[PDB]
Structures are given as structure tokens and as C-alpha cells.
Write a protein that binds this ligand. Structure first.
Ligand SMILES: Nc1ncnc2c1ncn2[C@@H]1O[C@H](CSCC[C@H](N)C(=O)O)[C@@H](O)[C@H]1O
Ligand SMILES: [Cl-]
Ligand code: NA
Lengths: 265, 265
């Protein structure tokens, strides 16, 4: 009679919370989805081993179109868990899933876990200074989306940082790298010329947040556009004007050039 | 020979991640602070049993003035852990402590945990739509902080949601309730008269996120300003322009007035 939305955290099988693991262990059925994000530091096998349960993976279609036929029926007479990378309900469409549960007469509870939205605090950039967030998508066919550029512009105009998620083809396991993101933004800048993203723009790259050895790098596009940030997933941040403490952290912890202490503060 | 910043999560001792527990278990010395937030579902004793270690609690002064004198010295010859509610770097000034660590020749690692910043997802409001965040501070003496009012105004004009962290006076054991925040906001509205926060403003209240039964309520200030949302901690959110699905969730789960479903495109 209960459905548990349980977050798996950021990187590996150990990013689940103690509460989340213990609850997952007591559930009769365990479902999971890895299309919104992928746990780059672990495997389904390792997660299953830790929880000690067989995990049925669901595709985007399974969830978006048939959640009420796959998951909810079982939650009517059993305890069921729905595992998702990060924190549950962060993915835009997941919250609506609780409405579906309600209508099916199923009680639902949310067990939180670390999300990239809060993990970015490791970059030293103040969380309150982040503005609207966006996703950088690959153009294709006659479609060249550029709204993420406008997001950066509006946030930066207000001295706010912009968190940019990069395109992911979960099924095909194809990750957009920070490098590709920068190349795309430079291309959008060449088209809109708003002076929003140029070779002189200061950016921050965070790779493998959650890992004990994440890659946190800060610098100008002209210098980082070809740097090796390691394996995905990658997150790109275009900070607004910096508080001196943010700048000092980027220099001391993220190897940013001393130059940002006078140019971007 | 190392310092770990480990988050404990939102509500109780089980909100810590598995990674964080296993590491905190092997540390020689464990310090902690509980002045940046409130974990309403646990106690120092319960946390100590889980970790199986004695924990030295530090005050804001111990940390801000003597972190390098109390904690770092030990990290040079031992594996030390510094615990904090939620995520250690979110809406705190702890990130700067990593710099002190570097200066002291101590390598540091960050172990994330559920944060109120991403837990807002449980309100049904799309997390990417939140803009600049702010804190509602208790006026002191003739000093009456009002900048948080302008943050709401700025976000609202852009159609973005505004997250409002509420004040805390840990030593005095004072925790600002959503009710007190609303009263302060109405007073600022009276002074500034920007039509930003009135009795007809729609707001969302989230209390004790992380618990299995948090209070999630949405409605007009006139109706919620005197409502009992339960024990602290509380967070206040002033939504911007709502998507239909956000409104649906607020009505179905947060008990919001059905009239909001009728969004004004
Ligand atoms: N479980 C919880 N429920 C509701 N609000 C919470 C909360 N935990 C923290 N807050 C809110 O955030 C404020 C602390 S700000 C520090 C936040 C912390 N580093 C984190 O990652 O969550 C509190 O005063 C309160 O307004
Ligand atoms: Cl293996
Ligand atoms: Na945000």
C-alpha cells in the first residue's frame, strides 16, 4: 500500500542515504530509472548487490506513459520502491508521478539524496547566487535551440550564476562534454553576439560530483575549451560577478588563474 | 592526514549517505556544528551511536574564529571529520574552511547529503525555475533587513520561483517559522509598497523536509499566515509564474485552492 520515491545520489552505489537503503531493503519490489541521469561511478549490479534486491529497470516510456500500470498496481498490496539518480522529484516530470499515485489510492513517501543542484556548492560559488537553470542541447536537423544562452544572459545581467546541465543520451550512453558545451555556446554567441559567452568568459566545470575525487576546474573559455576534464558526466557553470570569497576558492581549490581576482570580482 | 566535510542530511541521523557513514566510522576525531540548520528528527546521542564515535560540537565562534586551531591541528596527524546538517556547503560559509585546510597543508574531501535546496522538489515546483535565493532575517534593534523583498521582486518579474531560507538563532534555540516570515514580508510590503508580497500572494510552505511526513502547504498569505505548520525548520517559497502541472501538484498534494489551477497565461 506504499510507494517510496528513493534517491540514489550523485555518483556511486554509496550515495544513497542510510534511510533510503534500509527502506529499499524492506520493499517487496524495486524499480529504477536511469534515463534522467546515469550513476557513472557504479553499476546496476553493484546497486542490486548493495540493496540485495532484484531491480527492474524502467525506460522513459515505461515511466511517463505506463507508471500506473507497471509500478502502482504492485504498490497497492506491497511496499514498492522507485529509485532515481540524485534527489527524487528534481527531474521536472517526476513530481507529477505522485499525483498518479494518489489517484490510484497509493500512499507515497519521498526519501531524499544528494542532488547536483546542491552538490555544485563544492565549486565555492554561493548557492543563493544561482539564478534560473538550463540544459544545453545538441542542435539537429533544422533545429538549433538557444534558450540556454538567454538564460545565462538574464542571470549574469543580475549578477547570478547559471547552472547548465549538458545533453545526455542515456540509452545510447552518449554524454555531452563541457568542451562540446563551450564550443556550442561560442557558436551561439557568434550568432547572437550578445557578448554573453566568449573566449574571455569565466566558466567553471564540475565533473563527477559525488566522487571522492571530483574534477573542479575554473578558468577562461579560451584556456579550458580543450582541457581534459575526465569522464562524464560534466556540468558547466557560467558564474556572474564574483564575491571575493568565491574567487579565492576558485583560485585555491579549482586552479583558477589569479587573474579572476581582479577581472571577475 | 585528512579532513572530511560530511553532511548529515535534512531531518534525522539516517539522512546521512552510506558513503558518509562508513567514512565517519573510520575517522579518529569527529567534530560537528548544528548552528547552520536544524535536524528536528534526531539528537547528538542518536548520531553518535550510528557513527559509533564521540562528537565534539563546535559553536559558530569556534568554527569561524578557531577552526584552524581546534580542528586542523588534529587533521595533520589523524583522519578528522566535520559534520553539518544538510549539505555542508549549501547556504553556509563552510566552503571557505576548505581554503584554511589547504593553507594548513591538510587535504580535504566533501561528502554530500540531502539539502533543503533540492528537497524543494517535493513542493512540485520545477527546480530549474527557481531564481536567486534569499534569507528572511529577524530584525534587530533599529536594523530591519529588507533585501529579501527585492529578491522576490526580481525573480517574480522574470517569472521565477523564490526560495526563502528562514533565520535561526541556534544558541537561543529560535527558529523562524513561515508565519513570522510572512508577517515580516507584509511589513516590508507596507513600507516599500511594490505589490510584491500581499495577502493575495500565493506562497508555499515546506516544514521538516526529510521526515516521512513533512508539512507541504500552498495558498494565499491571508489564509496561511496564521496556520500551524508544525515544528521547525520551515522554508518559505514565493512561486513565480506556474506551469499547469506545478499548479496541479500544489492543489492535489499541497492542498492549494483549486482556483490556482486556472493559471493566467
Ligand atoms: N529539513 C528542513 N525542512 C525545512 N527547511 C529546512 C530544512 N533544513 C533546512 N531548512 C531550511 O534552511 C535553513 C538552514 S540554511 C543551511 C542549509 C543546509 N546546508 C542544507 O544543505 O540544507 C533553515 O533555517 C530552514 O529555513
Ligand atoms: Cl564489480
Ligand atoms: Na537553482
Amino acid at each position: 500500500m506504499v510507494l517510496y520515491f528513493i534517491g540514489l545520489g550523485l555518483y556511486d552505489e554509496r550515495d544513497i542515504t542510510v534511510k533510503g537503503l534500509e527502506i529499499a531493503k524492506k520493499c517487496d519490489y524495486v524499480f529504477a530509472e536511469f534515463y534522467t541521469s546515469l550513476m557513472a561511478g557504479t553499476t546496476l549490479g553493484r546497486i542490486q548487490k548493495l540493496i540485495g534486491k532484484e531491480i527492474r529497470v524502467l525506460s522513459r516510456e515505461d515511466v511517463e506513459r505506463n507508471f500506473e500500470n507497471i509500478v502502482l498496481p504492485l504498490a497497492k498490496e506491497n511496499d514498492v520502491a522507485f529509485l532515481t539518480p540524485g534527489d527524487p522529484l528534481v527531474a521536472t516530470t517526476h513530481a507529477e508521478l505522485r499525483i498518479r499515485a494518489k489517484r490510484a489510492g497509493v500512499e507515497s513517501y519521498v526519501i531524499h539524496a544528494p542532488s547536483i543542484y546542491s552538490a555544485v556548492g563544492i565549486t565555492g560559488l554561493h548557492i543563493y547566487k544561482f539564478g534560473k537553470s538550463a540544459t544545453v542541447a545538441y542542435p539537429e536537423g533544422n533545429w538549433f535551440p538557444t534558450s540556454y544562452y538567454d538564460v545565462i544572459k538574464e542571470n549574469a545581467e543580475r549578477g547570478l550564476h547559471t547552472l547548465l546541465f549538458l545533453d545526455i543520451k542515456a540509452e545510447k550512453r552518449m554524454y555531452m562534454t563541457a568542451n562540446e558545451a563551450m564550443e556550442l555556446l561560442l557558436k551561439v554567441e557568434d550568432m547572437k553576439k550578445g557578448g554573453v559567452f566568449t573566449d574571455d568568459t569565466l566558466v567553471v566545470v564540475l565533473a563527477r560530483a559525488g566522487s571522492l575525487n571530483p574534477t573542479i576546474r575554473a578558468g577562461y573559455v579560451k584556456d579550458l575549451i580543450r582541457e581534459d576534464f575526465g569522464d562524464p558526466p560534466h556540468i558547466l557553470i557560467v558564474p556572474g560577478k564574483l564575491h571575493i570569497v568565491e574567487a579565492e576558492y576558485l583560485v585555491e581549490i579549482a586552479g583558477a588563474p589569479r587573474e579572476i581576482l581582479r577581472v571577475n570580482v
